[PDB]
């Protein structure tokens, strides 16, 4: 009976879970694109989004600095969070991270894998799933339906 609980049980315990997640978050901020097991990447996605919000609060905020200090073990990253990532995501209200499933791991444990990144990074674009064009057969028929309904009141 684990109804309503919003966390995975990871690592050696609750504290170990935080540290495992913290290490992934630290890697994500530095490199902006990280591969982990799909479950662990999903666990860390929420923290990645909330960290940007703390960065938006501002450099001078004391709580933001303490939060940034705890989560970014490599302390050179803290300037990056407040002066690079937060300015980038000023317009958005959320959805800063992009997470997609990668083919399973070829390492005899066949782990389910994911790629987690921050949006807007400098790295080569991921091969995202592109929806079909309006020129396809089904789309054109729907486009015809849309035009008639809009034009005819």
């Amino acid at each position: 009976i684990s109804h309503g609980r919003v966390y995975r049980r990871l690592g050696l315990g609750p504290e170990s879970r935080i540290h495992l997640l913290r290490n992934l978050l630290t890697g994500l901020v530095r490199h902006e694109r990280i591969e982990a097991t799909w479950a662990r990447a999903d666990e860390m996605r929420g923290y990645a989004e909330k960290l940007i919000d703390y960065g938006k609060l501002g450099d001078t905020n004391e709580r933001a600095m303490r939060m940034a200090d705890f989560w970014l073990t490599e302390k050179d990253l803290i300037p990056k969070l407040f002066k690079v990532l937060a300015p980038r995501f000023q317009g958005q209200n959320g959805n800063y991270t992009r997470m997609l499933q990668i083919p399973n791991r070829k390492e005899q444990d066949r782990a389910k894998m994911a790629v987690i990144e921050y949006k807007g990074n400098y790295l080569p674009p991921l091969p995202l799933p592109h929806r079909d064009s309006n020129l396809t057969l089904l789309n054109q028929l729907l486009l015809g339906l849309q035009q008639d309904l809009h034009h005819n009141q």
């Binding site: 450099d59 001078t60 200090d69 302390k75 407040f82």
Partner: protein, 49 residues
């Protein structure tokens, strides 16, 4: 008025940079020893080949 933490390596991590910081921690004890005997004792107490 932003108090960024200093950009230094971890004290406890298993890395080369972290170990070097632990080296400086031990060496500071020598710098802070008033007597010449303590400085020699600290500098020579650990035996290796």
């Amino acid at each position: 008025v932003a108090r960024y933490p200093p950009i230094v390596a971890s004290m406890t991590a298993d890395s080369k940079a972290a170990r070097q910081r632990r080296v400086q921690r031990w060496q500071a004890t020598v710098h802070a020893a008033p007597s010449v005997d303590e400085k020699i004792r600290i500098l020579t107490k650990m035996q290796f080949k």
